[PDB]
């Protein structure tokens, strides 16, 4: 999904709020901040209600201005709450009564997702591949800066995982695929408007094609 969350390459942002090795203080700076990761694991691991991929996608489904104005831990409170409601575990009403106020949720999914490709290519380290120039309205773990671009595989995982585009929508056809570390020259991705050297992206097999 070509949403506002796909930020890499966006211009206009100012300084990163950090000097190296500055004291970061505690893990949690506010008393509710541990709740979104805890309750996400309760849903994944205790209730078996949704997968981690579904949590990434529901945060991508927040309305774009609401995503942009919400701090990180709060996006996961809204995210996990939306999946409880969508999964029929909670209702928005009871959340608002307990919150004593409006609890807006993420927007409904506009896509049913896509199955894992039935037939794919195993690639080898050192091979040149292209990231498929494809547009996917549901969840996908391909940042738009590398769509259609050319790079070299530097690693193939020894492990395999369900395809994000299917499991991030709770589909039963997610299969499993290895992913590949694909190295891109910085100028392949941002022409002369970059000061870096190379970018490595970890891409599922189904996103790639030879050449």
């Amino acid at each position: 999904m070509d949403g506002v969350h796909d930020l890499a390459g966006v211009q206009g942002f100012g300084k990163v709020p950090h000097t190296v090795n500055a004291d970061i203080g505690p893990t949690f700076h506010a008393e509710w901040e541990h709740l979104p990761y805890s309750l996400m694991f309760a849903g994944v691991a205790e209730l078996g209600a949704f997968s981690v991929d579904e949590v990434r996608y529901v945060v991508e489904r927040m309305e774009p201005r609401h995503y942009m104005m919400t701090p990180y831990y709060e996006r996961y409170v809204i995210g996990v709450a939306t999946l409880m409601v969508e999964k029929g575990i909670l209702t928005q009403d009871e959340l608002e009564s307990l919150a004593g106020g409006p609890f807006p949720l993420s927007r409904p999914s506009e896509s049913e997702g896509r199955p894992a490709p039935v037939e794919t290519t195993t690639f080898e380290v050192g091979q040149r591949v292209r990231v498929r120039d494809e547009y996917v309205p549901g969840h996908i773990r391909m940042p738009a800066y590398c769509r259609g671009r050319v790079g070299t595989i530097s690693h193939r995982t020894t492990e395999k995982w369900p395809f994000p585009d299917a499991i991030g929508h709770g589909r039963n056809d997610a299969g499993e695929e290895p992913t590949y570390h694909v190295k891109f020259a910085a100028e392949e991705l941002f022409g002369s408007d970059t000061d870096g050297g190379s970018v490595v992206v970890d891409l599922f097999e189904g996103y790639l094609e030879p050449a």
Partner: protein, 194 residues
């Protein structure tokens, strides 16, 4: 003629919890237990130990670079969001930096939970395109002739940078060497200093 509202976040957060726990859905002590883990077990001190061992043990360094999961498994430091580990090595001509441009993906069990600056839109947008400028602003100057490689954590691999051992650490024990390996050295934005 043709002419969002939210309760305070703390009230929404506690409401979500109270709604689940009421319904018998949250185990006793479950949330508190996770808070402890996130606070106490997921630690950049673990990543620093893996770096001081690689710096003093060439064979362990090669294992960390060829099968990072096996090398972390020797210490038992694998865990949620740190199940498939790949270590990336800095050399005299190459500086590696990690980001999750799409959200925040971090090797939790060995680097600790991501700091707020790593999760910022500023870091997520800018470090993939102008990593030399971003690191310079944060206080790390990388000479023009050193390649910078950014690893964008987009799938299940969780990364840790293996920085260069500084000059001047000759005869240093592993305990002394662990001390100069900070959280920021492991993300790739700081260079370890003597």
């Amino acid at each position: 003629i043709d002419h969002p509202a939210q309760a305070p976040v703390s009230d929404r957060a506690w409401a979500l919890f109270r709604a689940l726990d009421g319904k018998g859905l949250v185990p006793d002590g479950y949330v508190e237990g996770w808070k402890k883990t996130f606070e106490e077990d997921f630690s950049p001190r673990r990543g620093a130990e893996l770096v001081a061992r690689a710096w003093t043990d060439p064979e362990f360094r090669q294992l960390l670079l060829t099968d990072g999961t096996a090398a972390v498994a020797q210490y038992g430091y694998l865990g949620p969001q740190g199940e498939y580990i790949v270590a990336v090595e800095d050399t005299p001509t190459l500086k590696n930096v990690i980001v999750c441009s799409l959200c925040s993906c971090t090797a939790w069990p060995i680097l600790g939970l991501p700091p707020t600056w790593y999760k910022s839109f500023e870091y997520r947008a800018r470090v993939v395109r102008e990593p030399r400028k971003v690191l310079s602003e944060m206080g790390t100057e990388i000479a023009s002739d050193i390649e910078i490689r950014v690893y964008d954590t987009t799938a299940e691999t969780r990364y840790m940078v293996l920085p260069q051992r500084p000059a001047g650490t000759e005869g240093w024990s592993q305990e002394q060497l662990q001390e100069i390996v900070t959280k920021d050295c492991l993300i790739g934005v700081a260079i370890p200093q003597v």
